[PDB]
Symmetry: C4
């Protein structure tokens, strides 16, 4: 309510009264991988057992059409699967075959032509039942959405006059010595707005130019670096003074997107900054020290902000007051 997207990156959105629920089953794969693990591990368990006893019913039924059960002690009646006698054995024959274990205490014989077809359609279909599930287990393990746990954001965002221009800043860092190839940063300001025609938008997304023009959005992320957005005329913080910033009802949403290095999958690290986390007159503490040929990044001071001197007027007043300085 207070917050749109959590500081973890989770979003406070319930997707209400979706009516076309066939659309979830229209792409059964992607709605399967985004399940919980317990539900993934249960449906993985459920599909193999329902596969084996399905074929185990067919390995049972070919004994009844052939009458191998009707002459079980009669040894001249060579069965389709020898030593298959009961359903506990018939179901056991499928697991030995669909998993390609194949013990051969029960071994299919050649006198029966019917189950030879059943060796095909168990094995040619059991491979895709494997592949629909062994691939589903892989891409839930190798998903990029968990790489964001090692991409940390600053807990607060700060505002200070960086080189004459008032700038909004927040720190982002990577906790690994592996890289984020094609690392891009972008930022959306979301706030309720009301147009001149009465059309009130509840959570309107508005861009924040964190360097999309000059090429500064694509960033190099070995060390924690401060993402500075210059509060200029096009910025949505252009008329925000230090009087309004406790009273505003806005929310920054930052999205650090970039490909995982060891794969080609693209991670997305979301974080947010609400108007009680925006700090006026503060700046970040440095983290890089030089020691024995290497720059050491103390991550304990990653969030540490200290108060510096800063004017309290908005950037709209600060430019015009600078315009009176030349007179």
């Amino acid at each position: 309510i207070q917050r749109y997207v959590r500081k973890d990156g989770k979003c406070n959105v319930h997707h209400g009264n979706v009516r076309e629920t066939y659309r979830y089953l229209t792409d059964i794969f992607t709605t399967l991988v985004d399940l919980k693990w317990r539900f993934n591990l249960l449906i993985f368990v459920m599909v193999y057992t329902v596969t084996w006893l399905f074929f185990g019913m067919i390995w049972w039924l070919i004994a009844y059409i052939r009458g191998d059960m009707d002459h079980i002690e009669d040894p001249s009646w060579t069965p389709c699967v020898t030593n298959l006698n009961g359903f506990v054995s018939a179901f056991l024959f499928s697991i030995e075959t669909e998993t390609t274990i194949g013990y051969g205490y029960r071994v299919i014989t050649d006198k029966c032509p019917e189950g030879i077809i059943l060796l095909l359609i168990q094995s040619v279909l059991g491979s895709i039942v494997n592949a629909f599930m062994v691939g589903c287990m892989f891409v839930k393990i190798s998903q990029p959405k968990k790489r964001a746990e090692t991409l940390v954001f600053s807990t607060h965002a700060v505002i200070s006059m960086r080189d004459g221009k008032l700038c909004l800043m927040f720190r982002v860092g990577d906790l690994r010595n592996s890289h984020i190839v094609e690392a891009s940063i972008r930022a959306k300001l979301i706030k309720s707005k009301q147009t001149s025609e009465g059309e009130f938008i509840p959570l309107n997304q508005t861009d924040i130019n964190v360097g999309y023009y000059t090429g500064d959005d694509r960033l190099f992320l070995v060390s924690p670096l401060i993402i500075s957005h210059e509060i200029n005329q096009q910025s949505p913080f252009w008329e925000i003074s230090k009087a309004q910033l406790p009273k505003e009802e806005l929310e920054i949403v930052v999205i650090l997107e970039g490909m995982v290095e060891a794969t080609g999958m693209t991670c997305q690290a979301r974080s947010s900054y609400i108007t009680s986390e925006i700090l006026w007159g503060y700046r970040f503490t440095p983290v890089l020290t030089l020691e024995d040929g290497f720059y050491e990044v103390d991550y304990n001071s990653f969030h540490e902000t200290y108060e510096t001197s800063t004017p309290s007027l908005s950037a709209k007043e600060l430019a015009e007051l600078a315009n009176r300085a030349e007179s």
Copy 2:
């Protein structure tokens, strides 16, 4: 005819008299995965059976060169595969070996040196026959082109003066609590045009600036958000009044591209808006309500449009009439 691309996303295009049909077989993998499932499941079935009886013919023929069939009852003649007697058994030996089931009622012996080579070339080639097909079954299951079923578009597009500027708008929403990383929106206007030199183009694609300059095309898609294109001078709707919009022969094509979250594959969600679906003087109904800490998105009102007051002149007249207001 009336429509270029369907509201589902399918395109009303037949690809006519393609002559270089070897180009389809020049990349046999990608022309295989885009088949129907019945044709994928049939060619998967067809290739394993034609593999096993191919090797089963070679497991047959090594009995004839060795004369194991010529001394089948003679027990001193240890065969290359013992208990291999007929082609129904020889074909059965391949399925037990190429699938690596290996029952061992028929078990290859060491007295024969010829079939030892045949164990290699069945297993070293049966693995890639597996891999050319078990991978083909995977990427047809894990394809991003089915993720677009959960990316819904508004059924209509609307036009209304959003904050003094006339703007064309359409809603897009995501039906899941999973995200679309790197979600981009772009829009093409396609219409027949005739140049000054008589060169008439049948379906000429023309861009619609939905925010490609400012960075507004890359969008954050947890909640349904309105994609607004400002009707400015560079826009192709610049001289379109409400008199012409029933009479036009144009068609919007919107493309929402973005990577699937759980994989790295990029989905493409197409939709279209023809000149009977463009609404003048209408605007969307809001969908986000706040309830118990979470924003709940009622998707029943996702398409709901209501009529608001709007001038009926074009944006070319609306700017110049505004230019007469300052006089």
Copy 3:
């Protein structure tokens, strides 16, 4: 010599005296997949056989340390692998185990503790020998570089005054009803140039603005569409008249990049246009006809160019002669 990159897309470049040949073996995977298939199929064959007889030597040597061969007829000496007697049988035991066939005519026994370790290190290492090779066979099959065989280019490029501005044009089409998601077009002019300081560059790449500014480079590729580059002042064809175009020594290189739809891999379709393939005063024939609700694309007329009336002056003269028209 005449041509830099072929009309297929192959490049006429030999990579000379590369000295650091360890860099090829420093990434052994990617230098393996780009081999020919015969060399891929040979190294796949070579690695499994050298794996099995490697372990078959170890399955041999454990018989000598245990002396199972020294008491082969003596039945109280239960071997580590029973019925393992010779190297033809010992090598055969590895294929039955590393492929997980496991017939069980030769079956490992529990009296020996040494080969129990050998079951691990054969199976725990034979799985990655599989995975280093079954994955290598997959990504050579699923590579995007073969998707360019169904992306056709026009054989010629044309130049004609499209709507008052002289424009260079070439057609590109997709031969399938599957799409190219995120389809982008870009074009490089390569020609020898000599700077003012005598530094002569042999094949200097120079951009061609095919719509990179306005968003026209990202194209929608269901139907064959003409890629127009407007010959403006920044264009490298700005002072090229029809007198110079037979005499020039330039070469267009067009690159159509876009992701394959059924996967996430990005294809790259290269083609070229040399100064004998650039046509002045020509324009393309249309290909789209409307028939029974669908637009049918006759691909026979994909390359068909016809001569239209066009001024023969350059775009530098055509603007200035237009500048004299207003006088």
Copy 4:
């Protein structure tokens, strides 16, 4: 210390006092693949053996609940797994089953219902233990981060007046006849800076416009080509004369990003240039010669730089001195 990122591409950064070490285990897959191979091969070995003897304990314990050990010589007591007698045999039964070898000297029987469940939960869980590890071995083999070994950079960067404008240049080349699809080049200048407000940034990243505006950053990389950055007013080398360039404390970081051709993974090739590797008045030697229809690229002269005549003033003086030439 002297250097931020090595000429190989490695970065001289230690990631200090990371406290939230659960974040590494929160995404156990990606922190596994970035390990060393010895640690990957050990954890792969450790997980299969701890899996098999885990189930081998359960295959042991079902003999004690059933009392198969209590009637081992008594043949009427058909065990759950026949010929399972000791823990050396019970552990051996798991490897024959979890790997799906299945010799059948020990073969599970149907009289026991308990171990039938144990066939499921060994096989339905041993497949994902395979898949969590056979996929981990694949993506460590198929990673794009090793493709950068065949992407070479020039060892030095040079500065010379290319066509009236002073330009900073460095060569990049690809050692293979395979391509880098979507090859982009970007460059960051990193140097310590001190703002007007005393906020001293230790290693501030600053862009270098290598052609991000005109579309020149996306480059075509069949032949070694010189990446030229024009020293203009927005460039950070704008006031750098030849007097300051030995005395500066800056460092170029170049990043050549592009997708691997045979896969869809994106490589990232980093290199660096420190102020002792920047050459004033030097230019590269050409490498392309034409021979027998093909351009041959002598890679021995890839790094070769020769001294040319160049003014020693900065680009700020060179423009203004040119401004005095028109007077």
